[PDB]
Design an enzyme around this catalytic site. Sequence first.
Site, PDB file in Angstrom:
ATOM      1  N   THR A  32      55.997  50.104  36.873  1.00 12.12           N
ATOM      2  CA  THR A  32      55.168  48.910  36.543  1.00 12.12           C
ATOM      3  C   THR A  32      55.971  47.640  36.667  1.00 12.12           C
ATOM      4  O   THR A  32      57.134  47.582  36.271  1.00 12.12           O
ATOM      5  CB  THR A  32      54.600  48.979  35.091  1.00 12.12           C
ATOM      6  OG1 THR A  32      53.676  50.069  34.986  1.00 12.12           O
ATOM      7  CG2 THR A  32      53.872  47.721  34.728  1.00 12.12           C
ATOM      8  N   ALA A  86      50.461  54.298  29.447  1.00 10.12           N
ATOM      9  CA  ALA A  86      49.129  53.806  29.808  1.00 10.12           C
ATOM     10  C   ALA A  86      48.155  53.903  28.639  1.00 10.12           C
ATOM     11  O   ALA A  86      47.450  52.932  28.328  1.00 10.12           O
ATOM     12  CB  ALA A  86      48.597  54.556  31.005  1.00 10.12           C
TER      13      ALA A  86
HETATM   14  C1  3SD Z   1      46.208  50.948  32.266  1.00  9.35           C
HETATM   15  C2  3SD Z   1      47.663  51.251  32.640  1.00  9.35           C
HETATM   16  C3  3SD Z   1      47.965  52.296  33.521  1.00  9.35           C
HETATM   17  C4  3SD Z   1      49.288  52.557  33.870  1.00  9.35           C
HETATM   18  C5  3SD Z   1      50.307  51.782  33.330  1.00  9.35           C
HETATM   19  C6  3SD Z   1      51.748  52.052  33.694  1.00  9.35           C
HETATM   20  N1  3SD Z   1      52.257  53.264  33.035  1.00  9.35           N
HETATM   21  C7  3SD Z   1      52.381  54.425  33.675  1.00  9.35           C
HETATM   22  O1  3SD Z   1      52.043  54.615  34.846  1.00  9.35           O
HETATM   23  C8  3SD Z   1      52.965  55.565  32.844  1.00  9.35           C
HETATM   24  C9  3SD Z   1      54.446  55.751  33.227  1.00  9.35           C
HETATM   25  C10 3SD Z   1      55.120  56.951  32.552  1.00  9.35           C
HETATM   26  C11 3SD Z   1      55.334  56.766  31.051  1.00  9.35           C
HETATM   27  C12 3SD Z   1      54.626  57.570  30.152  1.00  9.35           C
HETATM   28  C13 3SD Z   1      54.801  57.429  28.774  1.00  9.35           C
HETATM   29  C14 3SD Z   1      55.701  56.471  28.302  1.00  9.35           C
HETATM   30  C15 3SD Z   1      56.411  55.667  29.201  1.00  9.35           C
HETATM   31  C16 3SD Z   1      56.226  55.813  30.577  1.00  9.35           C
HETATM   32  N2  3SD Z   1      52.119  56.741  33.114  1.00  9.35           N
HETATM   33  C17 3SD Z   1      51.265  57.204  32.203  1.00  9.35           C
HETATM   34  O2  3SD Z   1      51.163  56.716  31.080  1.00  9.35           O
HETATM   35  C18 3SD Z   1      50.361  58.370  32.654  1.00  9.35           C
HETATM   36  C19 3SD Z   1      48.979  57.747  32.888  1.00  9.35           C
HETATM   37  C20 3SD Z   1      48.011  58.575  33.749  1.00  9.35           C
HETATM   38  O3  3SD Z   1      48.402  59.486  34.474  1.00  9.35           O
HETATM   39  N3  3SD Z   1      46.731  58.218  33.650  1.00  9.35           N
HETATM   40  C21 3SD Z   1      45.653  58.888  34.411  1.00  9.35           C
HETATM   41  C22 3SD Z   1      44.724  57.868  35.095  1.00  9.35           C
HETATM   42  C23 3SD Z   1      44.221  56.829  34.103  1.00  9.35           C
HETATM   43  C24 3SD Z   1      45.454  57.136  36.220  1.00  9.35           C
HETATM   44  C25 3SD Z   1      43.520  58.604  35.654  1.00  9.35           C
HETATM   45  N4  3SD Z   1      50.280  59.441  31.628  1.00  9.35           N
HETATM   46  C26 3SD Z   1      51.316  60.212  31.290  1.00  9.35           C
HETATM   47  O4  3SD Z   1      52.440  60.113  31.783  1.00  9.35           O
HETATM   48  C27 3SD Z   1      51.089  61.264  30.205  1.00  9.35           C
HETATM   49  C28 3SD Z   1      51.635  62.486  30.252  1.00  9.35           C
HETATM   50  C29 3SD Z   1      51.273  63.151  29.153  1.00  9.35           C
HETATM   51  C30 3SD Z   1      51.687  64.591  28.838  1.00  9.35           C
HETATM   52  O5  3SD Z   1      50.487  62.358  28.364  1.00  9.35           O
HETATM   53  N5  3SD Z   1      50.379  61.108  29.088  1.00  9.35           N
HETATM   54  C31 3SD Z   1      50.012  50.745  32.455  1.00  9.35           C
HETATM   55  C32 3SD Z   1      48.688  50.474  32.110  1.00  9.35           C
END
Ligand code: 3SD
Lengths: 230, 235, 204, 246, 238, 212, 229, 198
Positions: free
Chosen positions: F1, F49
């Site tokens: 991000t 997210a």
């Molecule tokens: C709205 C929005 C989306 C994305 C972002 C940017 N974050 C991100 O991309 C983070 C990065 C990894 C991270 C996870 C946890 C703590 C720190 C870093 N990824 C995330 O949170 C992703 C989000 C995701 O895959 N969402 C599915 C869709 C909504 C796209 C369908 N989730 C996970 O990593 C996760 C994994 C487990 C187990 O529980 N949550 C910011 C805002």
Amino acid sequence: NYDGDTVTFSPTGRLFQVEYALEAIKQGSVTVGLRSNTHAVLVALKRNADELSSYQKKIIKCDEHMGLSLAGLAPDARVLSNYLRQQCNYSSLVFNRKLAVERAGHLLCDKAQKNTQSAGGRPYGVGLLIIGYDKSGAHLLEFQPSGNVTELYGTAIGARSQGAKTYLERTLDTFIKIDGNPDELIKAGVEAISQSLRDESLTVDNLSIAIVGKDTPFTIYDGEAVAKYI
Amino acid sequence: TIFSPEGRLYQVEYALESISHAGTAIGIMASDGIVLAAERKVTSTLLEQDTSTEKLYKLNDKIAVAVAGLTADAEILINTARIHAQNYLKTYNEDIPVEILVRRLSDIKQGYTQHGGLRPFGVSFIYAGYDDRYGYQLYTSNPSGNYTGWKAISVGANTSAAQTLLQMDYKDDMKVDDAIELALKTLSKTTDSSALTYDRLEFATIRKGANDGEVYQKIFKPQEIKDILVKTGIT
Amino acid sequence: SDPSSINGGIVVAMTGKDCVAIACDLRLGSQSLGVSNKFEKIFHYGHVFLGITGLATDVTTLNEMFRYKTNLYKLKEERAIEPETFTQLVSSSLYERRFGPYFVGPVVAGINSKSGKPFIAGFDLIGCIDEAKDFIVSGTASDQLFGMCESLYEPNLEPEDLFETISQALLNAADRDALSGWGAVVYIIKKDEVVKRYLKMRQD
Amino acid sequence: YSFSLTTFSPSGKLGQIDYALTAVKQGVTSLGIKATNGVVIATEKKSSSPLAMSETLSKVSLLTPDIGAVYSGMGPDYRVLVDKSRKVAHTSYKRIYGEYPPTKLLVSEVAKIMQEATQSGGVRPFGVSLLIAGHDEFNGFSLYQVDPSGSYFPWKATAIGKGSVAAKTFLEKRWNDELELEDAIHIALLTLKESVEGEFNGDTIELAIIGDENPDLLGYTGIPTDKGPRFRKLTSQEINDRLEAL
Amino acid sequence: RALSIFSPDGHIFQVEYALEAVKRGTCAVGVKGKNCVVLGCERRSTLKLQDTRITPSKVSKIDSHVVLSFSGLNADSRILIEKARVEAQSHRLTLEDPVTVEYLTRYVAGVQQRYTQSGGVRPFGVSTLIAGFDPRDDEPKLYQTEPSGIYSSWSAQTIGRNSKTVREFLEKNYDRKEPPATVEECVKLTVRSLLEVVQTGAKNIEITVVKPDSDIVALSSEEINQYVTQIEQEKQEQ
Amino acid sequence: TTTLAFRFQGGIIVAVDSRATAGNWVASQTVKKVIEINPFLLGTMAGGAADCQFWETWLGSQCRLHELREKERISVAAASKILSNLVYQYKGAGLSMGTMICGYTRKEGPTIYYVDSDGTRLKGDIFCVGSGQTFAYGVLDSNYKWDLSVEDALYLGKRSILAAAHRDAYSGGSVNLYHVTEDGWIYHGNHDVGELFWKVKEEEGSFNNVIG
Amino acid sequence: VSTFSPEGRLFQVEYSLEAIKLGSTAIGIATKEGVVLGVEKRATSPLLESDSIEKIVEIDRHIGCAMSGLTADARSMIEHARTAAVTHNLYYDEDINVESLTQSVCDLALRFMSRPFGVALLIAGHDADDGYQLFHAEPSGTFYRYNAKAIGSGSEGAQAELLNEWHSSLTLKEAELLVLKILKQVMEEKLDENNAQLSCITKQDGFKIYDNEKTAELIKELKEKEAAE
Amino acid sequence: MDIILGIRVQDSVILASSKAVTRGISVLKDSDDKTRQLSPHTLMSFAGEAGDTVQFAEYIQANIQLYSIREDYELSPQAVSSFVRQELAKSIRSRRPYQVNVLIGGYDKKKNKPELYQIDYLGTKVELPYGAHGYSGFYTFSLLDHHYRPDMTTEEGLDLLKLCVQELEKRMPMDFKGVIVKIVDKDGIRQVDDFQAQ
Ligand SMILES: Cc1ccc(CNC(=O)[C@H](CCc2ccccc2)NC(=O)[C@H](CC(=O)NCC(C)(C)C)NC(=O)c2cc(C)on2)cc1
Ligand SMILES: [Mg+2]
Ligand SMILES: [Mg+2]
Ligand SMILES: [Mg+2]
């Protein structure tokens, strides 16, 4: 001097606060219940406060196979039907089992009972008619805030209930046989409710109808949908 | 804890009434100190006046109280006052300012006034204290949770009589020895008893010793009261 | 990371003829860093003296707590607390925190105002009482202090002699400890008067 | 029932405490006399029937090895206060300072328990008055009276219950600040004779002293700093011995 | 145990009787100028031999820009003042702004209201006047609360014993078209109004002036005594 | 991000990328990392997210509640502090977020607060947050003037996000642009990096590190 | 406090209703172009600043409410209503139904706190499923929908006048005038812009309280329309 | 580590605090004020764990401001410091302690003397002529041991600090982006803005 609280018996063994709670029913707009062997119907004349006001809703759905009509304190019907929703819900989630109408009856009786035995609380002030279709067919129930519940072929509660209760008491052998015929059970219900009218001719807002049965989920009919029954 | 149609607190009024029968206590604020004097209600030859304490209590090294009302209700409140003082000292490394301690006690009383359905404490206090903000201070609190500060004041039995006399003989530029005298004279004329003896009295002073720079609390021994009686011509 | 060793410090106490002595160093460190050289570790409540080594925050907190308790005690009992009794108070206040103790090593010293009998005692962090008639030691140089006292000490020393013995014990014990020193104060205690002395010592 | 049952009346009286005092008034008479080397507490063992066993009832109770108590008013109320008092002598004092409390402070705690019953919700005041006699190193010998209000006061001598008025009077004539303990016992026995109706012997009279230390009542030898209880209940045989020399 | 209940006429008697204790309370008044608000309070007469150095005057500071005065039970007022002071600090801490006077009023009003419907508590025997200025604003503010929990703002207002009288005075003397454009003629109107009920006294009337940006000063016996003289002159000049 | 916000002459520029990842898996390229709280208030999201999305949606609720209670839009200072205080309650429980609260009020003017799940709350003129933050700072710090024209400031934000999308594996997708003035926020479009990169390469003549 | 009379009514609830009869009038009219709420300020004195009299409040953009009775009692209901509308939006990304909001306030009302509320509420709003709506919420916990309703000291008189004047094609402008009119009749004082306050909720613009200048113009238009016959 | 330094001269106390705020690999701000005014004559500087730092300071601030208004009186620096100590000493044994170190500089008007208090997150309190938290003390303590004198003027104290800062800019590994300096004397608290060039 003995009508202070429900925690008190009179010298003749009566509970006045319960008796007075029973009284709030007699001020409630009239409602009728009746059942054949394939359906159960609630007909509830709704009462209006003014000519500009709603004819307040007297029928509450409890599950896909169960529901009730109220006469008395509406808030109390809401507390109790809510408890009934939870109890029917619990039966589904935990046991994958539709709740028996009888079993609903015992549960309401027990909820009402506690309120007739502890200081600070007060008896419920609402009578309820309960219809359902379960694993043993159609069922109609009468709940009194004293905690007494009875299973009947038909009945009425509220103001001048006696008229409809008399009509039904005689029409018994005619309606119990309205199996497979829905519209004719509602007719008989409406024909019963009028024997307790006086006010007027029952109108399109006056009337509320509810049916449940063999392949019919509990549905409430209001207004335009009840026009064909007047 | 309810209001009358007039806007008065039944139980409070009745508690003040209780107090109006208790032995008298007097506080007099001088220029260089404070006097506390109090009369023991109901006495006997056999009552042990030596190892006795019933109207004058130490709260702190800089603060004492005189009690009119129910003794046992008073001990409850004295005890929590002693603790509040100590909490303040622990927290701040400074002895508690007189007002603050007094406000706290009044607040506790006010509580019983406003909630809980329990009877108010049947107690009035005179507070004598010294602190570095206002020097010498005299306070009074009663069952209503109300508190006020005084140059001279009395509580318990015969306050109207005693009040009039103090008003008559008190002056701003007084000295402690004169206040001691004034205290004794005033009790002398309001006693419900024959004459003022030593065994019917409790006496205390708070003085800023001329040799030092620190404040001393003296709770007069039986013999010391007896003596201070002769000097002022009550023998 | 052992809380007993973060700040540093020592306390020793000894009995003599109709007198007691209690001494302490003045260092307050954070590990290697000397931070304050005026951190006294001996307090008194009336004629009863309490020395406390160990974690400095608990030393402060304990003194405040014992000022509090002995104040209230004086008000209710209408007399000053005696050493034998304060000792039991220390003990039970420490044992009360049995499963989350204050990390300290307290030492009590004083003369009993009624018997005139001199009294010292020590405790572990959960209030176990060490009642020795000769000497009590505490702190990060405890071993050294034990060595000095067992060697130097004799019964029935006059206040002026006891002063020398206890000072030499402290000063030499201190000088073999990285975390102690930086100053020292000695209290000589008799029924009638108390002399407080500041020692000249190595400032390394 | 979370409200106080003792309230102020318009006259400023506290009704329930007064009525408690009245109950104390109907009680069997009890007394205490302070000597120079002792204190004595005494009362009558009113047997409800001759079939009842007199000894099986403690009217005079040990609270700590140097503190005794006796009462007038309601026996059962007294019995629970003795229990609560013994316990508080431990929880509030011995478990903190490793010595038993001094008389005035124990008395203070009892007074506290009684005050609370004067103010807490749903309760009635205790229907007793206590005479509490004791010794401690710093205050020496003492005697205190505690009333339903929670008020307490020290006496040289006093008496409570039925025949208190007359007994206070009789003591006033007989008390001087130079009494030996044996003298105080004798005076106590005289005062008690006036209030008692029927039999008057060692089996209808309960007496305890707070006197010297009784090493042979200690249970163990070895620690000379411990000398044993000052409280001692006199035996039926010991009372009769002093009655014959009236 | 429900103490504040309804009666057949639809009245909560305890709330009603609380008002009676306010009526019995010493008088208090506030008037708001063009660029100020002034608060005035009479002084009691149960006894006199008091120490005034230490005894709590009738106007309490809540924050540096807001003041509170009251008529009614003195002990009840301390409790409301404490809670108000705690809230004032709490609002700064979470909103990074001091309270608006209206917000602090709504808070206090809420507290009083809460005590009109809780088991085992009696309502507050207190009505308050709450005065000051919003942060960074010069428009003056004055609000009244009562034991029921109702509150509102006032061009001017009085509460306590013989407020009936003094409200009559202000109703014809306060011109909305022309608020007392000076601090001086604002204190003048405030003294005139108290005089009708006080029965002559310098140690009877106390005054406090509140200006914008935390400018709040109590007056002295003599400073007030100057207004006492010029008002009794202009009435005797007629 | 990568998210950025900076203050200048013409108000506030806010730009964010649109990539969500789980480990090395690219979960989405079209994710909304700006929350429009009210017409004058924006929140940006970085870290978990769920944590951002949940708590900032909630932040909007608490902001609306302030409007009803005080009959006045909440200040940036106060909105930022609601999030900040919430997040502080949860400290140690593993929440992961770094956010910027951006808006205009009359008493404050254009304001930016940085709030993270450590409980850090900072007022400032320029922030970049997220795994691409340093790539954005690089471009942005060396082109930032207070007197940038609105049009040049929008480009700078856009280009700074482009920079990070390019170098940071965990940034990419598209740029979402916002401008905040006296009148509130104005959306300045969604720009796919797929197209934006080549255009900017050609027009600006940069990205010489890049093949053909 | 939870006692039945032999008639089977709740003493405290009935007396609560008596307290409401003592309150300032509040009138609401529901049309197909909006719902209007109007109130009687009733300053206890001319010194009181009339604009500080808040008896019409916003609950959410699509829901307003007027009160009558012990108005201090309404703070905690309004608060609960606001929280409920906002929470629903948080949990469901939509506007709460007007009936649901009223039901939630009535739920709060049931919760016999030492006594019932001494205040009735007119809850007016719009939603897509059931259109414009008006509700009366009593301290009983019961609520009623009305085409038109009046509560407080002038209610018995006002309800009759509403019976006459209401028809299912009243324009919003017509309805506004009717509120002013019926208020003018039942108020002790002479109706002007400082002692009466108008408000409405339209689908297109939400709940708006009318400012004094806009209300004055309607008062003037009302006087002129009546001086024709 | 952030630099918080304090020195008490004859008639004032001077506080100097680093302006950098750094998370991970980035300096997020170069102008942070690591200080809250507790009362018009009492100032507190703080450093430690990211969130804890400001939350603690603002909590102490709100408590002190509240006391002032309840009593219409300013607590002494000694009193304020004992309050802070106790607060920290409580937190050290709770479920999640505040990881915050503080310096309290105040002018005691009743005594007419400046006072400097050093307190760490454990609740370790000490009064000192000069103090520091963290790695800072490792350079500055010896500096001041040498150059400090009890009867210095405020102007002499500021030249002493310049020396302290210089040493820290020479020998410390992290760029702490200069210090904010504030004086507490009989006239209250002012900020010396002229420290980047002197
Ligand atoms: C709205 C929005 C989306 C994305 C972002 C940017 N974050 C991100 O991309 C983070 C990065 C990894 C991270 C996870 C946890 C703590 C720190 C870093 N990824 C995330 O949170 C992703 C989000 C995701 O895959 N969402 C599915 C869709 C909504 C796209 C369908 N989730 C996970 O990593 C996760 C994994 C487990 C187990 O529980 N949550 C910011 C805002
Ligand atoms: Mg060791
Ligand atoms: Mg060494
Ligand atoms: Mg060294």
